[PDB]
């Protein structure tokens with residue numbers, strides 16, 4: 001299982017139910033880090049995607065609303081239904097794309113961290129969840145410089161130690 005996210009310097013992830021920034025290079029990497037996989041999102045992060053569902057992946061939407069309708073997405077109500085879906089498909093990797101209430105609900109079962117780190121600081125209201133960064137190694141780090149310098153970003157792959 002991987003966590004897919006992008007933060008600012010301080011660990012901010014969201015503002016007012018949307019992204020605090022617009023970064024196109026990172027949302028092209030959101031597409032193709034999840035083209036083909038089982039993508040898990042909380043119900044609020046699903047509703048804030050422009051296309052609903054976004055294509056070519058399984059979108060799994062976690063919601064406590066028994067009646068919630070998302071045509072073409074896998075609508076489930078608890079974590080044990082996400083893993084009971086992921087057990088049915090042994091060839092598709094599980095990717096937890098957020099927000100903060102879903103990254104709490106799979107905190108214990110993550111093995112990889114796919115972080116984008118923005119060099120700047122943005123205003124918002126949601127942070128990334130606290131994680132034991134000492135339990136993971138940074139394997140791979142690739143920087144991309146943007147002509148807005150707050151938007152210069154590093155893509156970092158972390159993998160959990162034995």
Ligand SMILES: COc1cc(Cc2c[nH+]c(N)nc2N)cc(OCCC[C@@H](CCC(=O)[O-])C(=O)[O-])c1Br
Pocket residue numbers: 004005006018019024025026027028029030031045048049050051054055097098116
């Ligand atoms: C709510 O706002 C968003 C937040 C994210 C969240 C997010 C972004 N980036 C990263 N790396 N981690 C995240 N958790 C993704 C997203 O759409 C991904 C869009 C993929 C599009 C192509 C987008 C593009 O043209 O760049 C597609 O059609 O597959 C949107 Br819109």
